[PDB]
Design a protein around this ligand. Structure first.
Ligand code: HEM
Ligand SMILES: CN(CCCC(=O)c1cccnc1)N=O
Ligand SMILES: CN(CCCC(=O)c1cccnc1)N=O
Length: 464
């Protein structure tokens, strides 16, 4: 029993005095610099091992992939999921749900021509919607989120929602509110002190109501799908999972049952909406602070693609600049700064430390995206980070916004395709005008915590 070094905690409050709830990333970088790249923290009463920089994250999550593939505690969410659903499960449950969720999303077209066509189909509606604003200043938040969510929604529910469906707008707010809550100083405090904070009035109460709203909605859709299920012709992710529950009814230890379906579906609908939506939203702001970057992306679209032919995922090979920009938006944007919490599944020897079974591990993916050894200017927006001196696309080992190892984001293929298609389709059609000159636009985050949330803004879409 020999743990990574770390600051001496106080009872219950843990390392609270050294952890500034407003910028947790800075606090943890300060502690790493003091104690070393691998260190122990007390997040309220919870003992956690933290990993800082590429080497430390990669050594754990890759070199010891099997030991570090457990899912740790996440207080904003555990009260609801309770260890069910793909994203929140462990061991055997995680393997089954993951394997099926992957096979099933491939079956509806993910990673092939079919999802490409669904994204092109949905982008079309966004085009119509944005033209329909006639260059007025709009908050792009829900314009983007409607379109993004409709891709995953098609797959998981069988049909897109209408843009004017008021229940659809509601659900989107639920996702937006609860996602942002994990970025706030209150979200951070909650992670430390949930056993008290759950019973107190506060922004946490609204996050709970939204997460509950999302669950009740998925439950209601699953009930409807049961009542009308055709077991030889599945219309969606829900049907396929239902069909698989039928087939596993004889196995009293199956992971395939209603709770795991509701929770996994919740995971896909939520994960499939908010991250891509937020990445787009941050990217637009970044591109209006950098019109010379927007311009070069424009000339690349104009040259490889055209003013009208709709982007296909193949075009990216011939567009290293746009690809560098997109990746740079993901690296700069640092959507999930701690990823999702991990834990060791067995007693584990890591460097010269011993991590007993169940030890919680926070991979600092943000410390990797901003690791100075991999990025010439880690703290600037610089597409040159993903370009060689020939102007060709250059991959980086520190490019980890989807995490790495056994639990890596299996939405990765889908996200990359959406980001490329949606950036390129939108920018084909419109240039972005800010009601502010490039130099007064603040690209620093509104909230940084378990998510990175861009500042509110408005913008004009001006047609080409
Ligand atoms: C820009 C978009 C996205 C980013 C930045 C992102 C990032 C991440 C990260 C950092 C994790 C944690 C993996 C770990 O435990 O280490 C994760 C997990 C996960 N993501 Fe995403 N993701 C994105 C899009 C999506 C999409 C579109 C889906 C829907 C298919 C999705 C579904 C999932 C699921 C189901 C997990 C849990 C996997 C598991 O527990 O084994 N993600 N994602
Ligand atoms: C409420 N939500 C919590 C976790 C979602 C998640 O794991 C995620 C989010 C963005 C990208 N990939 C995964 N899941 O339903
Ligand atoms: C917003 N984000 C959730 C971040 C996961 C989280 O809540 C957490 C908690 C403790 C340590 N690491 C991540 N996913 O949608």
């Amino acid at each position: 029993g020999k743990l990574p070094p770390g600051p001496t905690p106080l009872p219950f409050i843990g390392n609270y005095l050294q952890l500034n709830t407003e910028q947790m990333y800075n606090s943890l970088m300060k502690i790493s610099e003091r104690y070393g790249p691998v260190f122990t923290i007390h997040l309220g009463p919870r003992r956690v091992v933290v990993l800082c920089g590429h080497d430390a994250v990669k050594e754990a999550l890759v070199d010891q992939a099997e030991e570090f593939s457990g899912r740790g505690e996440q207080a904003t969410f555990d009260w609801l999921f309770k260890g069910y659903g793909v994203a929140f499960s462990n061991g055997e449950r995680a393997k089954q749900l993951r394997r099926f969720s992957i096979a099933t999303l491939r079956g509806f077209g993910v990673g092939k021509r079919g999802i490409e066509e669904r994204i092109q189909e949905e982008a079309g509606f966004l085009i119509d919607a944005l033209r329909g604003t006639h260059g007025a200043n709009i908050d792009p938040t829900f314009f983007l989120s409607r379109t993004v969510s409709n891709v995953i929604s098609s797959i998981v529910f069988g049909d897109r929602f209408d843009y004017e469906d008021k229940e659809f707008l509601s659900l989107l707010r639920m996702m937006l509110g609860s996602f942002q809550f994990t970025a706030t100083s209150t979200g951070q405090l909650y992670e430390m002190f949930s056993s008290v904070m759950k019973h107190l009035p506060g922004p946490q109460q609204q996050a709970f109501k939204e997460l509950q709203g999302l669950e009740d909605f998925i439950a209601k859709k699953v009930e409807h799908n049961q009542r009308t299920l055709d077991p030889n012709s599945p219309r969606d992710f829900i049907d396929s999972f239902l069909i698989r529950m039928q087939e596993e009814e004889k196995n009293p230890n199956t992971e395939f049952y209603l709770k795991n379906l509701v929770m996994t579906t919740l995971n896909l609908f939520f994960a499939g909406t908010e991250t891509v939506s937020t990445t787009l939203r941050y990217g637009f702001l970044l591109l209006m602070k950098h019109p010379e970057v927007e311009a070069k992306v424009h000339e690349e679209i104009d040259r490889v693609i055209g003013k009208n032919r709709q982007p296909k995922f193949e075009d990216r090979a011939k567009m290293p600049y746009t690809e560098a920009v997109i990746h740079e938006i993901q690296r700069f944007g640092d959507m999930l700064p701690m990823g999702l919490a991990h834990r060791v599944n067995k007693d584990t020897k890591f460097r010269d430390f011993f991590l007993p079974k169940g030890t919680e591990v926070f991979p600092m993916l943000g410390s990797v995206l901003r690791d100075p050894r991999f990025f010439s200017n880690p703290r600037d927006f610089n597409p040159q980070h993903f370009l060689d001196k020939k102007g060709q696309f250059k991959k980086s080992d520190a490019f980890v916004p989807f995490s790495i190892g056994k639990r890596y984001c299996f939405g990765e293929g889908l996200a990359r395709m959406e980001l490329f298609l949606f950036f390129t389709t939108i920018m084909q059609n419109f240039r972005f005008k800010s009601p502010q000159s490039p130099k007064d636009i603040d690209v620093s985050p509104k909230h940084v915590g378990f998510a990175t949330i861009p500042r509110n803004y408005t913008m004009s879409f001006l047609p080409r």
